[PDB]
From Swiss-Prot:
It is a multi-pass membrane protein. The chain holds residues 100 to 668 of 706 of the full protein. This is Sodium- and chloride-dependent glycine transporter 1. The keyword Transport applies. GO terms for biological process: glycine import across plasma membrane; glycine secretion, neurotransmission; glycine transport; neurotransmitter uptake; positive regulation of heme biosynthetic process; positive regulation of hemoglobin biosynthetic process; regulation of synaptic transmission, glycinergic; sodium ion transmembrane transport. Residues 110-159 are extracellular.
Length: 542
């Protein structure tokens, strides 16, 4: 199989995988959309009671078998569709993640001037409604009428934005060249990629907490609102954000943990990684809300109702406030470089684990010697599939994919995996496996969580979210019916992998009754257990 080499290497690589654009781009506007501190309490509850336990379960389940997200299902061969669903969601996410990366590239290239181009209203693309501070903002109108050239409907496919296509091509080429040249084999690139963003965040924090009005923004960011928590929308959003940011049902955690040694302490690593991820999100929220409050104080309005709701918050509200500071291009360059690094770090690991899973599934030696060709094919397919997201209607499709194809399907898949492990295989068997691996049983908190707490919370959230369903929208724009249907189909595509594969596997099982075939297809295979022979003892001994 192959080991890692050291524990700090695995920890740093997992930090690079986990902390990305979901800490600095998606978490801020998801927190702003849910009225600040009304989002924090469900977020922390869902982190404490569902996220860390499932993170630990996934890491231990990867480490015990020395198998990836597809080969670990020898424990129950009929439930192999969980890994296929994980792969489908990974493909969905990796199509549009790199489009977000290329938009960051475009802004980084545009920041290389003495004067920022979104600072004034005296440009050809500006209208008579433009009103700057040097309400229609110059930054918003730069974003909407110059960079995107947004259409009026999702079905209005206009022209392709050539600069965005160039940025997307450059991004894909960079990722491919990093993948095929063995960049991760160097300890200077991994260290830099997962450490410099913290320096940038520290500098931005120090710059933004010394401004007049920052305390008002911080207070809005941290003050709870007890009357906006009894709604299922905020709970669903918090669950989705937690699972997306921890990368639970992506499938790469199992593949990454399959390279760990048998007696490695996987219980401490999961805690470290989860705490680091959430602390990074909170720190970025501080950084953004400080100058949100400063800008609100400048404009004379409340901390809320100062910016629009949507994924463009980091591309519109932040630079418009940066424009009011001295040496603005420096801050802009730092911000966009940090975003680019965070995105590329996650994209590299996603593609690596996906290619590894495909190659392992195919099996034969012919595909082992043609791994570069598989990587090139996957990259070409990703670029070609992301091409239509760079048109005048691209942001509609991107928002739909973000909110439907990678939202709350991860929670369902993780819950199904947990239930399958705990109730078909047996919780006592898994506890014995964990004690075999670690030398002590898992703590009772995790046992209670896995057996009772997380599935019940997920079930209640699912039920009350399904009962109360609002239709997606984007700043007073109402999506048509067929777009909502396409979003539902995208959500269902990954979930449907489980029952379909279960029926396909049942169709080829021996027996004379349905119950007999159900019993035969659910018991562990002959090769389930530890990989190495000296670890093959107790209940697995020959
Ligand atoms: Cl987060
Ligand atoms: Na994250
Ligand atoms: Na990253």
């Amino acid at each position: 199989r192959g080991n890692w080499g050291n524990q700090i290497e695995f920890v740093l690589t997992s930090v690079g995988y986990a902390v990305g654009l979901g800490n600095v781009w998606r978490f801020p506007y998801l927190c702003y959309r849910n009225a600040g501190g009304a989002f924090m309490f469900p977020y922390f509850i869902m982190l404490i009671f569902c996220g860390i336990p499932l993170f630990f379960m996934e890491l231990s389940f990867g480490q015990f078998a020395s198998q990836g997200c597809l080969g670990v299902w020898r424990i129950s061969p009929m439930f192999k569709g969980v890994g296929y669903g994980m792969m489908v969601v990974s493909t969905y996410i990796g199509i549009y993640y790199n489009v977000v990366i290329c938009i960051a590239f475009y802004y980084f290239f545009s920041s290389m001037t003495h004067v920022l181009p979104w600072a004034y209203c005296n440009n050809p693309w500006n209208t008579h409604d433009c009103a700057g501070v040097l309400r229609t903002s110059p930054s918003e109108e730069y974003w909407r009428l110059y960079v995107l050239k947004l259409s009026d409907d999702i079905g209005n496919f206009g022209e392709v934005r050539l600069p965005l296509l160039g940025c997307l091509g450059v991004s894909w080429l960079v990722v491919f060249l990093c993948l095929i040249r063995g960049v991760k084999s160097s300890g200077k690139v991994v260290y830099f990629t997962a450490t410099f963003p913290y320096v940038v965040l520290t500098i931005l924090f120090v710059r933004g907490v010394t401004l007049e009005g920052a305390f008002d923004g911080i207070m809005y960011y941290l003050t709870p609102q007890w009357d906006k928590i009894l709604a299922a929308k905020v709970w669903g959003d918090a669950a989705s954000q937690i699972f997306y940011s921890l990368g639970c049902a992506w499938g790469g955690l199992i593949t990454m943990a399959s390279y760990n040694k048998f007696h490695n302490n996987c219980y401490r690593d999961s805690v470290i990684i989860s705490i680091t991820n959430c602390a990074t999100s909170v720190y970025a929220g501080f950084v953004i809300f400080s100058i949100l409050g400063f800008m609100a104080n400048h404009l004379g309005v409340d901390v809320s109702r100062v910016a629009d709701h949507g994924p463009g918050l980091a591309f519109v509200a932040y630079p418009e406030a940066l424009t009011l500071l001295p040496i603005s291009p420096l801050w802009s360059l730092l911000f966009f470089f940090m975003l680019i690094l965070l995105g590329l770090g996650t994209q590299f690991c996603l593609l690596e684990t996906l290619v590894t899973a495909i190659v392992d599934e195919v099996g034969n030696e012919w595909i082992l010697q043609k791994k570069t060709y598989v990587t090139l094919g996957v990259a070409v397919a990703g670029f070609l599939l992301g091409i239509p997201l760079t048109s005048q209607a691209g942001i509609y499709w991107l928002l739909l994919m973000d909110n439907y194809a990678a939202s709350f399907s991860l929670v369902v898949i993780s819950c199904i995996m947990c239930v399958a492990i705990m109730y078909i295989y047996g919780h006592r068997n898994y506890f014995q496996d964990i004690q075999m691996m670690l030398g002590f049983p898992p703590p009772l908190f995790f046992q209670i969580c896995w057996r009772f707490v997380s599935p019940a919370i997920i079930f209640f959230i699912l039920v009350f979210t399904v009962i109360q369903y609002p239709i997606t929208a984007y700043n007073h724009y109402q999506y048509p019916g067929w777009a909502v249907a396409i979003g539902f189909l995208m959500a269902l595509s990954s979930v449907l992998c489980i029952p379909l594969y279960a029926m396909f596997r049942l169709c080829r099982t021996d027996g004379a009754d349905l119950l007999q075939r159900l019993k035969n297809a659910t018991k562990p295979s002959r090769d389930w257990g530890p990989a190495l022979l000296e670890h093959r003892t107790g209940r697995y001994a020959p």
